[PDB]
Amino acid sequence: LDFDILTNDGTHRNMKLLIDLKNIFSRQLPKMPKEYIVKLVFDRHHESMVILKNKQKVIGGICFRQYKPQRFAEVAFLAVTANEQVRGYGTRLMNKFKDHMQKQNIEYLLTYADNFAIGYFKKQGFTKEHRMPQEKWKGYIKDYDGGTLMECYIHPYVDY
Numbered sequence: 001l002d003f004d005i006l007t008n009d010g011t012h013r014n015m016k017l018l019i020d021l022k023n024i025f026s027r028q029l030p031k032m033p034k035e036y037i038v039k040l041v042f043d044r045h046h047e048s049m050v051i052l053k054n055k056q057k058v059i060g061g062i063c064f065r066q067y068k069p070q071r072f073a074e075v076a077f078l079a080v081t082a083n084e085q086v087r088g089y090g091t092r093l094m095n096k097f098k099d100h101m102q103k104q105n106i107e108y109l110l111t112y113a114d115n116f117a118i119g120y121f122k123k124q125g126f127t128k129e130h131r132m133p134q135e136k137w138k139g140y141i142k143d144y145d146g147g148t149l150m151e152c153y154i155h156p157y158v159d160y
């Protein structure tokens with residue numbers, strides 16, 4: 001099991017793993033428009049950490065967008081393929097991601113919870129109540145009335 005940041009570098013290998021991840025996102029988020037998932041995943045501002053099984057089988061991942069100078073990032077999509085769930089991968093992935101964001105000097109993670117995912121994000125330390133003022137992410141992260149915006153603080157010296 002490897003947790004690697006997947007770069008869209010135009011290579012057959014990488015773009016294959018990104019499509020694989022996009023397809024997992026699509027299946028785990030049936031209501032999310034597939035063309036929209038493709039748009040964000042291959043976007044110049046988005047990055048993806050994938051759960052690589054046996055060096056070539058992606059079984060899950062997180063697609064995120066860093067707002068570097070602002071020190072916060074948005075988790076656009078997160079999922080683990082159905083036949084690999086309840087095996088501890090979801091938590092390990094978020095932990096590896098938090099460790100990466102910590103090293104990236106990102107102090108806050110924001111995400112609009114899938115509602116079927118709220119329990120997961122609550123479990124990963126995210127909260128419905130914000131510590132970061134809306135004014136802070138206003139103009140960077142979209143403000144939707146629907147969906148639950150949940151936040152998670154990344155402490156500078158907590159071991160993830």
